[PDB]
Amino acid sequence: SVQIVYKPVDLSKVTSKCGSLGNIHHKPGGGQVEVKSEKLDFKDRVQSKIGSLDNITHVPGGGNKKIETHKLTFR
Amino acid sequence: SVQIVYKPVDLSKVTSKCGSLGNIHHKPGGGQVEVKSEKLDFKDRVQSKIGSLDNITHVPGGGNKKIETHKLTFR
Amino acid sequence: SVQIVYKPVDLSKVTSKCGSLGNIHHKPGGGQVEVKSEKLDFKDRVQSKIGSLDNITHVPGGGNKKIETHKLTFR
Amino acid sequence: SVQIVYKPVDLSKVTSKCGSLGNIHHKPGGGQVEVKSEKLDFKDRVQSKIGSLDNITHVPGGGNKKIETHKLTFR
Amino acid sequence: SVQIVYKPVDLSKVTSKCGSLGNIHHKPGGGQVEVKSEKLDFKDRVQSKIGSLDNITHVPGGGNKKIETHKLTFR
Amino acid sequence: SVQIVYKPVDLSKVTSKCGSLGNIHHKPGGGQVEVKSEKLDFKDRVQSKIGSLDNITHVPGGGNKKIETHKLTFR
């Protein structure tokens, strides 16, 4: 006679921590900003940011991905 | 005689923590901003942000993805 | 004689925490913002934000996604 | 003239994780236990536990305690 | 003239992780236990544990304690 | 004129990790235990533990303690 016992077990842990975690920013101060523009000419897309204090966190990453394939074939 | 026992078990844990988590911003201060513009000419899209203090979190990422395939074939 | 026992088990846990979580902003302050414009010409779409303090969280991500395929074939 | 501005601020965070957290037990096994008693004499309290596999978590601790005193006195 | 501004700020973090955390126990096995007792005499309390595999976590500790005192006196 | 500005800031982090954390125990095995007792006499408290594999974590410690005193006196 024959017996097959197919019992793979996944007990893993997976963690991702991405971007800005647990930081302290203490009394941060931006300076005065002046922009003077005269007679400028633009023939294409203009993309502009003017500020004094910017805090930017950008996270395209940090996803957790599992691909698993299981397979049993008899005769 | 024959027996097959197909019992794969997933008991795992998956976590993502993405963007800005648990940060302290204490008295952050933006400065004065002046923008003066004269006689400018634009022939395509203008995209403009003017501010003093910006705090920005952008998260296209941090998704958890599981793909699992199971298969048993007898004769 | 023959027996097949097909009982794959998913007991796993999945979590996503995406964007801004548990942050403290204590007394954040934007400065004065002045924008002066004269004789400007725009020949396509203008997209503009003028402000002083902006707090922005954008989350296109952070979705949890499961694809699972099961298959049993006898003769 | 006189001004007083009494504004103490508590923004702190307090966490306890006490006992048995996030452990994995995989296929633990207790052995055979045989207890034979004859002609025994007991003249005060008997407290008995007989088993094979015991898993025990006892937490008298892990409590979070805050005591805060505020006081403002003028003349 | 006079001004008093009284603004102590608690922004701290406090964490305890006490007992058994994040451990793996893989196939732990207790052996056979035989206890034979004959003609024994007990004239006070008897406290007994008999087993094979015991897993025990006891946590009287891990409590977070904050005591804070604030005081303003004018004349 | 007079001004007082009383602003102590606590931005600290405090962490305890006490007991058994992140350990791996792989196939630990207890042996056979035989206890034979005959004609023993006990005239005060008996405290007995009989086992084969004991795993014990005891944590009276790992508590975090903050005591803070603030005080302002004018004339």
Provide a descriptive summary of the structure in words.
- Chains A, B, C, D, E, F: The record marks 7, 13, 17, 27, 36, 39, 66, 71 as: Not glycated.
- Chains A, B, C, D, E, F: Tau/MAP repeats lie at residues 2-32, 33-64.
- Chains A, B, C, D, E, F: The modification Omega-N-methylarginine is found at residue 45.
- Chains A, B, C, D, E, F: The modification Phosphoserine is found at residues 1, 20, 48, 52.
- Chains A, B, C, D, E, F: Glycans are attached at residues 43, 49, 65.
- It is classed as protein fibril.
- The structure is a homohexamer of 75-residue chains.
- With 75 residues, chain A is an all-beta fold.
- Chain A has no helices and 10 strands.
- Chain A has strands spanning 2-6, 9-10, 13-21, 24-26, 33-38, 41-42, 46-50, 53-58, 65-69, 72-74.
- Chain A is elongated, with a radius of gyration of 28 Å.
- The first copy, chain A, starts with a strand and ends with a strand.
- The C-D interface holds C 22, 24, 26 and D 9, 11, 13.
- Strand 8 (53-58) of chain D pairs parallel with strand 8 (53-58) of chain E, so a sheet runs across the interface.
> Which oligomeric form is depicted?
homohexamer
Total helical elements of chain A: 0
Strand content of chain A: over 45%
The percent range for helix content of chain A is under 10%
Sheet of most strands of chain A: none
Q: Structural class of the secondary elements of chain A?
A: mainly beta
SSE order of chain A in H/E notation? EEEEEEEEEE
The span between the termini of chain A is 14 Å
Q: Measured on Cα atoms, how large is the radius of gyration of chain A?
A: 28 Å
Q: What is the count of β-strands of chain A?
A: 10
Largest interface chains and counts:
A-B, 75 and 75 residues
Which overall shape of chain A is indicated by the principal axes computed on the Cα atoms?
A: elongated
PDB class: protein fibril
Keywords: Amyloid, tau, protein fibril
Assembly: hexameric
Entry title: Tau - AD-MIA3
